[PDB]
């Protein structure tokens, strides 16, 4: 039938995990609040899940915010069926780049790029593309 799990979508930019928790704790006690985010960048996928201790509170929240127009977003709220525990929604951060070490010596890597150039030459000769050297 129905569970105490709420699926929210068409979220605005500023609606995040703590904002959803602060807004829906008014409707009722929340077991868990999760937000779908991208893995490599810290940007919302504009949907998430929440879990009320009371399924009646979840139903009240759904009939309250089902078609709420918010900052140009017509919010969508659904009550999930029995079961379907929310999982695998990690609060990712913004990842950064950093240069690691290169264990290959200079002579070996120059030889490897020369062999790669030779392989390109062989590929060009096989293809019928007459490029010199």
């Amino acid at each position: 039938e129905y569970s105490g799990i709420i699926y929210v979508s068409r979220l605005p930019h500023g609606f995040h995990e703590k904002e959803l928790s602060k807004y829906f704790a008014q409707f009722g006690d929340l077991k868990e609040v999760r937000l779908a985010r991208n893995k490599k960048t810290g940007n919302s996928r504009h949907y998430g899940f929440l879990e009320f201790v009371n399924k009646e509170d979840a139903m009240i929240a759904q009939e309250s915010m089902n078609n709420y127009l918010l900052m140009g977003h017509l919010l969508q709220v659904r009550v999930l069926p029995k079961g379907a525990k929310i999982e695998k929604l990690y609060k990712y951060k913004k990842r950064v780049l950093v240069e690691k070490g290169i264990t290959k010596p200079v002579k070996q890597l120059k030889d490897n790029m020369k062999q790669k150039h030779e392989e390109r030459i062989k590929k060009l000769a096989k293809s019928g593309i007459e490029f010199k050297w």
């Binding site: 930019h13 500023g14 602060k22 918010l70």
Partner: protein, 247 residues
Amino acid sequence: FVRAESIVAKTLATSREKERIKRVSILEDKKAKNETQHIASGKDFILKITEGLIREKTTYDGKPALLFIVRVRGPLAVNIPNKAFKILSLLRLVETNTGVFVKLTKNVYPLLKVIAPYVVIGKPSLSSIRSLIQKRGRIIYKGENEAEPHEIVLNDNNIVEEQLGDHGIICVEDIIHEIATMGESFSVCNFFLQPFKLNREVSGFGSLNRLRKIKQREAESRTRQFSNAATAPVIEVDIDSLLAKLN
């Protein structure tokens, strides 16, 4: 109750304020190291706005200057960040309608750039300084028969003579002289004086006062500008007319 629109608006405005303060902090670290190869601009700008309004964007000469700083209400739906709150608390500007004197130098300019959207910054004239001190002058003084000190007006020159006389300050006129000339014991006088509690220019909620509030908000929006540009000039307004309205 709290509305989701208010929550999201506060979140977005606070995030943009934090982004602005972070960019200003990065630029100030680069300027402090003062050898960075990559920088947009490496100098300090002053945008003086006077009165139909004219704005002059000049450089900062670097010589110390006298400023009056008034704490005004900040941007709407913005939670004040820790850095701005720390600077305002060190300047004793925790609440609005409160004014202090600041000796602006090269190391004072970045703090003003950080706290720009919460303060009105001006050059006080001698008459404005004298009117401010003689009208609203308060100190925290500990009486001999008093178990705990309290805040009283700057009414007695004997208290000034017994608290700052060793530094050479005997009276309210001497305090005014040191504040105006930015001389010796400027910090001592400026912290002997409590922060100046100004009154609001428009108060009340009748129809006349609400229309005056609309006009005041229009004028303030026209004058004050929020650049959010990490190299924004420090904006200087007519603090003489502002204090004439606020005192």
